[PDB]
């Protein structure tokens, strides 16, 4: 669609860091049988666990399709709000609004990016995203929060900010011809400065190995822990295709400076021992000719970097790895000493459909007064 006549930055807005205070978290509800095994029941139960864990820290709203509303309302505790919303799949980091705030009429707004199911008619993950195109408008209308609209295609999982002017992104995703092939790097930067209130960029060339379907979203590779400090997906195994990506990202990060002129300190957050979809898993997924196939043997895009920050809580995946799960809890607990770190077992169930906890959440900042 078209772009708002004035940008967020013209009105004083910017995207705050994820660790700033939230009013609530938004989460979708999975259902489609060609992405979620066994009629989505195992994933529904893990989404409900993620939502419940977040609800201990802050309010949660789960949005569920007309067909699923009663099921979601049964599976969620009563203090989680459940609302009806049509969607083509349940990845609200990507299809939901990117909220923005200001200091100095409302002091919160949301950005409704364009969307094409991570690469459109050619290269997208499913063939119909027309419900997804309305999710951001519907969420913002629910909350009576003003909306800015962009014509640019963007997913929230592809951008990360420190709240101090820096934006961390991947070239693999935002420069892919399947997103905005009419725009240069410089033009994409200009739009992100105007809409996120950022001044400078850190461009990692590639995202996580195994995340070809999003084209290497930043949120599954590297994120800020606080200004000047990032967590980076890591392996020491030179035989894993991940290694060359991690080493290249570390080299870029060690030659980067943030928008306020700090060097970037990197904390390595080790990926689990490689995970692969099993035949039993793949056999529970339909092939209706509407979505990409989910095949036995696929390397899962599993990284503990795909955690979510809530008010006083870190909600982190657990993948069953007998050392990396506990290492991730420890590293995150040390890196966020004022937060409680909660692990979600069976996060694998989300990773079978190509993302994890961070991909299924969208924070609504508290509105500054």
Annotated binding site: 213, 219
**Among positions 137, 262, 268, 299, the unique one binding Cl ion when judged by CB under 5 A:** 137
125 is catalytic: no
What residues from 278 to 317 belong to the interface with Na ion (CB under 5 A)? 297
Q: Which residues are annotated as a binding site for agmatine?
A: 213, 219
Q: Which two tokens stand for residue 225?
A: 């822990």
Give the integer Cα–Cα distance in Å for 345 and 77: 18
Any residues with CB less than 8 A from the CB of 128 and at least 6 apart, and which? 88, 290
Q: Which window, 115-123, 157-165, 203-211, 317-325, contacts K ion (CB under 5 A)?
A: 115-123
> Which of 275, 347, 291, 357 lies closest to 91, judged by CA?
357
The label of the residue with tokens 């200001």 reads 102
Give the integer Cα–Cα distance in Å for 86 and 325: 35
Give the integer Cα–Cα distance in Å for 17 and 329: 21
Q: Which is nearer to K ion, 55 or 176 (CB)?
A: 176
| CB 20 to Na ion: min, Å | 30
Q: Which window, 62-70, 134-142, 220-228, 237-245, contacts Mg ion (CB under 5 A)?
A: 134-142
Are the CB atoms for 269 and 250 separated by under 8 Å? no
Task: List contacts with ligand 211 (CB under 6 A).
Answer: 35, 89, 91, 94, 118, 125, 213-214, 353-355, 359
Give the integer Cα–Cα distance in Å for 279 and 298: 10
Q: Which is nearer to ligand 211, 118 or 201 (CB)?
A: 118
Q: Which two tokens stand for residue 362?
A: 């969208």
Query: Is 113 an interacting residue with respect to Mg ion (CB under 5 A)?
Result: yes
**Among positions 36, 113, 118, 148, the unique one binding K ion when judged by CB under 5 A:** 118
Query: Is 49 an interacting residue with respect to Cl ion (CB under 5 A)?
Result: no
Any residues with CB less than 8 A from the CB of 238 and at least 6 apart, and which? none
**Among positions 8, 157, 207, 343, the unique one binding Cl ion when judged by CB under 5 A:** 343
| CB 31 to Mg ion: min, Å | 20
Pick one of K ion, Na ion, Cl ion, none as the site partner of residue 123 (Cβ within 5 to 8 A by kind). K ion
Q: Torsion over CA of 239, 334, 21 and 150, rounded to 10 degrees?
A: -10
Q: Which is nearer to Na ion, 62 or 230 (CB)?
A: 62
Residues belonging to the active site = 359
Binding site for Na ion (CB under 5 A): 297
Binding site for Cl ion (CB under 5 A): 137, 141, 342-343
């Amino acid at each position: 669609s078209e772009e708002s006549r004035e940008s967020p930055a013209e009105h004083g807005y910017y995207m705050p860091a994820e660790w700033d205070s939230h009013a609530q978290t938004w989460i979708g509800w999975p259902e489609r049988q060609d992405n979620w095994r066994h009629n989505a029941l195992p994933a529904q139960r893990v989404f409900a666990g993620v939502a419940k864990a977040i609800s201990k820290f802050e309010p949660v709203t789960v949005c569920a399709s007309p067909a699923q509303w009663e099921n979601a309302r049964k599976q969620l505790p009563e203090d989680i709000r459940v609302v009806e919303m049509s969607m083509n799949d349940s990845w609200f980091r990507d299809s939901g609004p990117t909220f923005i705030v200001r200091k100095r009429n409302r002091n919160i707004a949301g950005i409704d990016w364009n969307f094409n199911a991570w690469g459109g008619a050619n290269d997208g993950c499913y063939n119909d995203w027309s419900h997804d195109l309305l999710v951001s408008r519907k969420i913002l209308a629910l909350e009576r929060i003003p909306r800015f609209q962009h014509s640019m295609i963007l997913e929230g999982g592809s951008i990360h900010v420190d709240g101090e002017g820096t934006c961390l992104v991947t070239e693999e995703c935002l420069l892919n011809k399947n997103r905005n092939p009419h725009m240069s790097k410089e033009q994409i930067e200009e739009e992100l400065k105007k809409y996120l209130g950022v001044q400078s960029f850190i461009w990692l060339p590639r995202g996580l190995y195994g995340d070809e379907d999003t084209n290497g979203h930043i949120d599954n590779m590297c994120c800020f822990a606080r200004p000047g400090v990032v967590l980076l997906s890591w392996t020491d195994d030179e035989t894993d295709p991940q290694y060359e990506r991690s080493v290249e990202a570390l080299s870029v990060l060690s030659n980067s400076i943030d928008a306020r002129g700090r060097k970037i300190q990197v904390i390595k957050l080790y990926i689990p021992e490689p995970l692969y979809m099993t035949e039993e898993e793949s056999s529970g997924i339909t092939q209706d000719g509407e979505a990409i196939p989910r095949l036995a043997g696929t390397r899962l895009a599993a990284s503990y970097v795909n955690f979510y920050i809530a008010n006083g809580g870190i909600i982190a995946p657990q993948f069953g790895d007998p050392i990396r799960d506990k290492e991730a809890i420890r590293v995150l607990s040390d890196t966020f000493p004022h937060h409680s770190v909660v692990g979600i077992e069976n996060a694998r169930e989300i990773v079978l459909a190509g993302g994890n906890i961070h991909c299924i959440t969208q924070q609504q900042p508290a509105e500054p007064t």
